[PDB]
Amino acid sequence: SLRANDAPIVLLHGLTGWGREEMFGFKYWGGVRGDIEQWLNDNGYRTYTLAVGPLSSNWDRACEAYAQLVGGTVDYGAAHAAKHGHARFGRTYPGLLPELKRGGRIHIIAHSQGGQTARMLVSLLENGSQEEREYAKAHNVSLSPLFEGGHHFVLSVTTIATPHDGTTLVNMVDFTDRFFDLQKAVLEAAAVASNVPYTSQVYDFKLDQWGLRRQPGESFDHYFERLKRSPVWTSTDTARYDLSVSGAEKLNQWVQASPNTYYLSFSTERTYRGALTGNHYPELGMNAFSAVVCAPFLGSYRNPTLGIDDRWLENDGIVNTVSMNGPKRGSSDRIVPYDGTLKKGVWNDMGTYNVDHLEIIGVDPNPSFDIRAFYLRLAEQLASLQP
């Protein structure tokens, strides 16, 4: 399809993720398969990578992504910061694309929870935040342009394996310990040990606002035990909260599709239905951690109070497949099956792929998945969008 726009692509990770200089260079986008950003750039699609708080709320992540893009100091909003008890200002970025302030735009390819973040950034650009605008006036303090509303710089958003309606994984027993074991599993995939007090940061959780950071002589094992007992895990201003079925619904209540942006969604599944009671089980090849620790539960959990039933059993090892085509719980967004033409202001359901949560980004191997072809095709589709 003929390129219809020149907007660069911006990669955005989920509940795990780090920058290109982190993890000794092991890329979140590509993992053991390679470097996706490089593949796209070498193929004529200008691409950049964002790095935000993996365990932080989508709100914090959107403010971080905003500053990373246009440049400046992260501003979480005076009202938000006062309400949750963390700093109003985060770190300062030089800005990857300052031209966004003069008419330039971008496409966002987001994986996992990154899809919630991408949607929220678009929502905030378009409408800002009334609570933040009022608070600033009443307290005589400045207001980030992000909260003013009337802004727009994202032409398209593609989400991959995103828990738009949340994931039932959060309702599991010891989800807390198992979620951090997931972090440890990802560290191992990147050939990083969790019982070594690395002097270099290696994996920065970007918890500047919470005043948290791995200490000199501290291992990730020990650090994660501290994080489990910290606000980035125990408060409502967290990825943990937004990841739940409850939290994702509350998010869907205000984060709606903008009529000025094209949304594409890719779903993932890596399970088979058994013959006992119709539960789903991990297929051979699923990354070990999910197959053992997460798939079993996702494929069998049911909660009457939350409306969790049989449509939710199919999963990709981390997220329920039904939750990926677009937001539905508490959402008025419209989702339409890809018919050959991408439409604005709605979710274009691009289908379901037989790849798990980590294989889709190359963190776990899957020889049968032509990851390079997948991303080049996604880049071409975004490049085909009429501005």
Question: Can you say which residues are annotated as belonging to the binding site for Ca(2+)?
Answer: 285, 359, 364-365
H-assigned helices in the chain: 36-42, 58-70, 78-84, 114-127, 130-139, 175-189, 220-228, 231-234, 239-243, 245-254, 288-289, 295-298, 371-384
Helices and strands (DSSP H and E) totals, the chain:
13, 11
Residue 225: CB atoms within 10 A of its CB come to: 14
CB of 312 to Ca ion, least distance (A): 23
**Out of 175, 282, 364, 381, the residue judged to bind Ca ion by CB under 5 A:** 364
Segment near Zn ion (CB under 5 A), from 26-34, 175-183, 229-237, 265-273? 229-237
187-190: long-range contacts, CB 8 A cutoff, minimum separation 24: 187/220, 189/26, 189/31, 189/32, 189/287, 189/358, 189/363, 189/364, 190/23, 190/24, 190/26, 190/31, 190/363
Three-class secondary structure of residue 69 per DSSP: helix
Annotated binding-site members for Zn(2+): 60, 80, 86, 237
Under the criterion CB under 5 A, does residue 22 sit at the interface with Zn ion?
A: no
Of residues 97 and 248, the one with the C-beta less far from Zn ion: 248
Three-class secondary structure of residue 257 per DSSP: coil
Q: Which does 320 bind (CB under 5 to 8 A by kind): Ca ion, Zn ion, Cl ion, none?
A: none
- Cα distance between residue 133 and residue 46, in whole Å: 35
Of residues 204 and 356, the one with the C-beta less far from Ca ion: 356
- Cα distance between residue 163 and residue 113, in whole Å: 6
Q: Report the DSSP beta bridge partners of residue 56.
A: 238
Q: Report the DSSP beta bridge partners of residue 165.
A: none
Residues involved in catalysis: 112, 316, 357
Of residues 90 and 299, the one with the C-beta less far from Zn ion: 90
CB of 57 to Zn ion, least distance (A): 5
Residue 340: CB atoms within 10 A of its CB come to: 5
CB of 287 to Ca ion, least distance (A): 6
Pick out residues in 52-111 that bind Zn ion (CB under 5 A). 60
Three-class secondary structure of residue 74 per DSSP: strand
User: What distances in angstroms separate CA 245 from CA 104, 165, 275, 305, 361, one per listed residue?
Assistant: 35, 6, 27, 11, 24
- Cα distance between residue 16 and residue 37, in whole Å: 17
Under the criterion CB under 5 A, does residue 237 sit at the interface with Zn ion?
A: yes
Q: Which does 212 bind (CB under 5 to 8 A by kind): Zn ion, Cl ion, Ca ion, none?
A: Cl ion
Tokens coding 56: 């932080």
Under the criterion CB under 5 A, does residue 366 sit at the interface with Ca ion?
A: yes
Under the criterion CB under 5 A, does residue 132 sit at the interface with Ca ion?
A: no
Q: What are phi and psi of 292, to 5 degrees?
A: -85, -55
Annotated binding-site members: 60, 80, 86, 237, 285, 359, 364-365
DSSP 283: P
Question: What DSSP assignment string belongs to 175-204?
Answer: HHHHHHHHHHHHHHHTT--SSS--SS-SS-
Under the criterion CB under 5 A, does residue 132 sit at the interface with Zn ion?
A: no
Q: Which does 251 bind (CB under 5 to 8 A by kind): Zn ion, Cl ion, Ca ion, none?
A: none
Of residues 126 and 208, the one with the C-beta less far from Cl ion: 208
Pick out residues in 276-315 that bind Ca ion (CB under 5 A). 285
Q: Residues touching Zn ion: how many (CB under 5 A)? A: 2
Segment near Ca ion (CB under 5 A), from 44-52, 190-198, 199-207, 362-370? 362-370
CB of 218 to Cl ion, least distance (A): 9
Of residues 33 and 214, the one with the C-beta less far from Cl ion: 214
Q: Which does 237 bind (CB under 5 to 8 A by kind): Zn ion, Ca ion, Cl ion, none?
A: Zn ion
CB of 215 to Cl ion, least distance (A): 6
Q: Which helix (H) or strand (E) covers residue 144, if one does?
A: none
CB of 80 to Zn ion, least distance (A): 6
Of residues 85 and 337, the one with the C-beta less far from Zn ion: 85
Residues that bind Cl ion (CB under 5 A): 212
Q: Which residues bind Zn ion (CB under 5 A)?
A: 60, 237
Q: Which residues bind Ca ion (CB under 5 A)?
A: 285, 359, 364, 366
